[PDB]
Design a protein around this ligand. Structure first.
Ligand code: DF1
Length: 268
């Protein structure tokens, strides 16, 4: 019931590689993130320890781990749908109703995380996995960390993530709040789903495309493909000052967020 055959190598992280793992008698398929700590006892010890806390429907479940000398094995909910990256066609994005549905589920997980005091720190379509019913699942807590413990917030100073999805305060300020950095990356994800392209390489004044966004030139490419209603949400999310930036409770009160677009399940 636990003799796990490694059926087919499924993907490849920078740290190691994932394999599909189907059981003998039950056939319960799981994902097995495999990382050689030599090829450490801390960077992956924090990923497991955060994972042990996490239990949400929009967060890749963590089943267990095993030590195995040098290599560590992370046993995680299998998402047969793959990445949300592959449901975004270049230069178009995806149907607006699918975007809104994925965004509702992205906010649900991110709220949950922020409630248990942790921040993902690297939200992007590659780390957002769909299951078999296409439900979204926040993946990879390798860069995640505690920003709140015993009801006291601590600020972040470690710079990390992916440059196009990273918030501007991450580059300028010495220290910053965690939650608005996640909101920013979620707003970049919305842009990708609706436009099929990333707006810029990084939110730095040395980047022309970021300065054009700050000048409200929404006649240029990423933003011209979008639509007033969702674009107005992105206007409230992609605000340079993280204090002025919209918070998740207020994203839930947004017009487009609560605009009805998508039907129910076909014959279910
Ligand atoms: C840190 C982990 O959560 C990432 N791995 C997964 N974990 C749980 N479920 C997963 N499903 C996939 C997947 C990859 C490609 C096709 C279908 C599924 C994967 C997957 C996706 C991309 C690369 C490697 C594995 C996956």
């Amino acid at each position: 019931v636990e003799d796990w055959d490694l059926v087919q190598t499924l993907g490849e992280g920078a740290y190691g590689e994932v394999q599909l793992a189907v059981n003998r008698v039950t056939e319960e398929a799981v994902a097995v993130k495999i990382v050689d700590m030599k090829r450490c006892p801390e960077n992956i010890k924090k990923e497991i320890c955060i994972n042990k806390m996490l239990n949400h429907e929009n967060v890749v479940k963590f089943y267990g781990h095993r030590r195995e000398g040098n290599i560590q094995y992370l046993f995680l909910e299998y998402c047969s749908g793959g990445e949300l990256f592959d449901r975004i066609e270049p230069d178009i994005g995806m149907p607006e109703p699918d975007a809104q549905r994925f965004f509702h589920q992205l906010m649900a997980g991110v709220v949950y995380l922020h409630g248990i005091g942790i921040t993902h720190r690297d939200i992007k379509p590659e780390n957002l996995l769909l299951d078999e019913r296409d439900n979204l699942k926040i993946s990879d807590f390798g860069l995640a960390t505690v920003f709140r413990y015993n009801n006291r917030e601590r600020l972040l100073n470690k710079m990390c993530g992916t440059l196009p999805y990273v918030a501007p305060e991450l580059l300028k300020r010495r220290e910053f709040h965690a939650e608005p950095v996640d909101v920013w990356s979620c707003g970049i994800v919305l842009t990708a789903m609706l436009a099929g392209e990333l707006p810029w390489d990084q939110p730095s004044d040395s980047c022309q495309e970021y300065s054009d966004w700050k000048e409200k030139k929404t006649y240029l490419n990423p933003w011209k493909k979008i639509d007033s209603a969702p674009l107005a949400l992105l206007h409230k999310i992609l605000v340079e000052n993280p204090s002025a930036r919209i918070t998740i409770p207020d994203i839930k009160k947004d017009r487009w967020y609560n605009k009805p677009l998508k039907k129910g399940a076909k014959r279910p």
